[PDB]
Amino acid sequence: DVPSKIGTLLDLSATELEQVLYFSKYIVLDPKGAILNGVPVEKRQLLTDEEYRELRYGKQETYPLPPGVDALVKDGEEVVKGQELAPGVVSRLDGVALYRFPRRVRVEYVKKERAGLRLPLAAWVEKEAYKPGEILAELPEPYLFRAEEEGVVELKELEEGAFLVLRREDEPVATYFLPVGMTPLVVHGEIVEKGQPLAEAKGLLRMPRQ
Amino acid sequence: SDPVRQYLHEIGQVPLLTLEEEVELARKVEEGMEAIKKLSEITGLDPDLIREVVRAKILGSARVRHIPGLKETLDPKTVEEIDQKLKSLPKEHKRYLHIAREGEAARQHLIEANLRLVVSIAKKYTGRGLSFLDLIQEGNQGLIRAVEKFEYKRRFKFSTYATWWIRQAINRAIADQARTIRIPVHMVETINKLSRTARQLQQELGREPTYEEIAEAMGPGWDAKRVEETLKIAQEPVSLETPIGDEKDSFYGDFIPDEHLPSPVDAATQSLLSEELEKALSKLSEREAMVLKLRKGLIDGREHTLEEVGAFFGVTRERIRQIENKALRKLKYHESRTRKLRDFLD
Amino acid sequence: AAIDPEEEVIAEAEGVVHLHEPASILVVKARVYPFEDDVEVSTGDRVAPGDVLADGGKVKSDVYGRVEVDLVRNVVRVVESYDIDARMGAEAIQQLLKELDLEALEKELLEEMKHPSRARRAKARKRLEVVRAFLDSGNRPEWMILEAVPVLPPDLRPMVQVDGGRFATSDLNDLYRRLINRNNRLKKLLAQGAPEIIIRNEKRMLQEAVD
DNA sequence: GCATCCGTGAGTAGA
DNA sequence: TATAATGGGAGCACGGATGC
Numbered sequence A: 001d002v003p004s005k006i007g008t009l010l011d012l013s014a015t016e017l018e019q020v021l022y023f024s025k026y027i028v029l030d031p032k033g034a035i036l037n038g039v040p041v042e043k044r045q046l047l048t049d050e051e052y053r054e055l056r057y058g059k060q061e062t063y064p065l066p067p068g069v070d071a072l073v074k075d076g077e078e079v080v081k082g083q084e085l086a087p088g089v090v091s092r093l094d095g096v097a098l099y100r101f102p103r104r105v106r107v108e109y110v111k112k113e114r115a116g117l118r119l120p121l122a123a124w125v126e127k128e129a130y131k132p133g134e135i136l137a138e139l140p141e142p143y144l145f146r147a148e149e150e151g152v153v154e155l156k157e158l159e160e161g162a163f164l165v166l167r168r169e170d171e172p173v174a175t176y177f178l179p180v181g182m183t184p185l186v187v188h189g190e191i192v193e194k195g196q197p198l199a200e201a202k203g204l205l206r207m208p209r210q
Numbered sequence B: 001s002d003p004v005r006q007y008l009h010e011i012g013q014v015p016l017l018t019l020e021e022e023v024e025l026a027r028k029v030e031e032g033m034e035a036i037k038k039l040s041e042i043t044g045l046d047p048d049l050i051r052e053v054v055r056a057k058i059l060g061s062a063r064v065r066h067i068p069g070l071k072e073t074l075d076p077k078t079v080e081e082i083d084q085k086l087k088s089l090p091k092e093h094k095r096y097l098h099i100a101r102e103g104e105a106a107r108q109h110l111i112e113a114n115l116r117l118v119v120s121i122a123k124k125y126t127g128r129g130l131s132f133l134d135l136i137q138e139g140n141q142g143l144i145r146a147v148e149k150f151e152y153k154r155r156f157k158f159s160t161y162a163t164w165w166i167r168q169a170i171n172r173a174i175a176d177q178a179r180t181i182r183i184p185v186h187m188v189e190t191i192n193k194l195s196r197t198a199r200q201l202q203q204e205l206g207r208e209p210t211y212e213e214i215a216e217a218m219g220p221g222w223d224a225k226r227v228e229e230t231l232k233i234a235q236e237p238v239s240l241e242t243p244i245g246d247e248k249d250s251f252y253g254d255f256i257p258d259e260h261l262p263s264p265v266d267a268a269t270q271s272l273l274s275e276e277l278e279k280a281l282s283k284l285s286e287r288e289a290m291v292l293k294l295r296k297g298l299i300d301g302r303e304h305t306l307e308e309v310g311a312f313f314g315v316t317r318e319r320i321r322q323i324e325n326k327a328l329r330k331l332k333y334h335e336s337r338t339r340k341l342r343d344f345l346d
Numbered sequence C: 001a002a003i004d005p006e007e008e009v010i011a012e013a014e015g016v017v018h019l020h021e022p023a024s025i026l027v028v029k030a031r032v033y034p035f036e037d038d039v040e041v042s043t044g045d046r047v048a049p050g051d052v053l054a055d056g057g058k059v060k061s062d063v064y065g066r067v068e069v070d071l072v073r074n075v076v077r078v079v080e081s082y083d084i085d086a087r088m089g090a091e092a093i094q095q096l097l098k099e100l101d102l103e104a105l106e107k108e109l110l111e112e113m114k115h116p117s118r119a120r121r122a123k124a125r126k127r128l129e130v131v132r133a134f135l136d137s138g139n140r141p142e143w144m145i146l147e148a149v150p151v152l153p154p155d156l157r158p159m160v161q162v163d164g165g166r167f168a169t170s171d172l173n174d175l176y177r178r179l180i181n182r183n184n185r186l187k188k189l190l191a192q193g194a195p196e197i198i199i200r201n202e203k204r205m206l207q208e209a210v211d
Numbered sequence D: 001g002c003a004t005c006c007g008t009g010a011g012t013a014g015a
Numbered sequence E: 001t002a003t004a005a006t007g008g009g010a011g012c013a014c015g016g017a018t019g020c
């Protein structure tokens, strides 16, 4: 009934009253120190669904990743607006990025072993331990590493560098470590005698990165 | 302005679930229910009460109300005490509380996401006596039942299982709420079968069937009388405001007499009847007239037995029955003489 | 883990776990709070700065927000947001109408009656007329909002058997039926804890029914 | 001052 | 009670208090 009695008492236009009563907009009874767009929320303020949702439940967004394409950022890492989350994805907001349904789980298994190697004394550089990439030794001339045991060969190749395990029967009788710059002359399942060269060391030889 | 559009838009704000997301939410829901069961085991509390408390905390203080199944009224005090009795558990026990919370949240999101399916199903049920939005809400109830009953272990898509409960809810709704005079769902189904039967017969015969033909086509146990009575019982009422004459002037209800309230002629008739009966009972002695009045109930409104009137006047039942007889006899004589009370006999 | 035991992924030996190729990436505005011990708040709880989160009070909250407890990542996450009470419909309107003190508004509108602008005086008068109406009459303004809805006696909206043995009835019965149905459905929807969209829609429909 | 928004436009009979 | 299904459908007039 125009002008509205409810609208006149509460100082609300027909539009605003309509929007509130018909659930098109929220209206603020207790601001509870809310802040929207830099201005603190006043009592009796009219909020849209997006504003009220942003205020009450927070802000966030999910970005789809194309198949077979890995993410650029890390799980749990803070993000800045404009920062690329992936080659095809740019984040619109700032905050914590979370992984949604990782399709591939890569498990790095820890292995602690013990392996022998033989080198010319002049080539070796004495150290109590070796960091990955650190120089193990330097050969003035090509050198041949010779098998000190007899048996069948198990050749286990890492990203770079290799492990070579000699075994008679079931039990491994020897374990050798071939660093980078050392080319194995044997294949898997090959039979070797003592003195028969396993690998060739040519020039500088260093520890693998892994 | 247009509620349908506004609700479609509100529905559109929730994004659809990827298979992974759907499976996740369903999983969280199932594990959640299991966690509520576990909390019921540990706490020795009611699964319902715990569920309502967890739900109350997830939804917030905005919605707090007494639940029909709960033996205890649910108020912020009670949910606070129960929340504290839950948080007072050891770590491994307190785990299930978190599982339950996230379970309820997942339930909420699952429903909110599958809200569109309800629309797409309900749009086909229009014109059945229920409004579009009504069908949507009932379909929503179906959707909720589905979310609660779903098992992700079967590898099926949620839409498949939910569709059944949505259709079921909508059909239940229509069968229940469509008619002004409520017809039990089974009877409704019967009436509808009768409809489709008669329609098949009219489509084959090239004319409307008789009661007998429908009775035949309905199988054993159906005769013409039964079909006729079933059609009679399926009749919907008509509006008193249906306009008669083509104009804004007249209403059907204006032509319908009132058979309940007594006409002035009726009131006059009964009044004259009581007055004439009193005129006739005054020609007797007060005792026999009182006996007749107590025996026919003119006094207190009810008819006394011979033993009660005999005990009221302090005489044998035989005596009071004899007094009743002589009174009736004197009245019959007075009536034969004056012919006054004849006209009231109709 | 997975649906069937044989399809599960179990770690053969000691090692560290890395996640790659996620289906999607969800960026939230949130503050992350790792926990080494039992956590004192659950998921969904609203939290203000200084409140105890986990570890017997060692780790607490910086911002205002809603708590998501992540048991997988072993972190209590707080998504920044508030406790704001902002409502919808005649519930909100009735609330605001209850909080009204008519005398104060009378004073303020009287102050507005002295303004030089004719328009502001006009509006202040038109408001003050309603205010003073409610004041003199002794009517509480919130009575303009219906909690209980009266029902007209059935004889004034009759269901009657006519001549031929059929039934004729008023439209008021149909309207009342609509109202009762939507009301009951709303109560049941609430009792089963339906989400907000469904309840909002139901309430809207209830309003249109009363209308 | 010119864009909305809204309420109302004989009577009896009859049907 | 489980294949999957996911955003509707239809449809003249003048005078007067208000509202931008």
Ligand SMILES: [Mg+2]
Pocket: B215, B216, B217, B218, B219, B220, B221, B222, B223
């Ligand atoms: Mg038959």
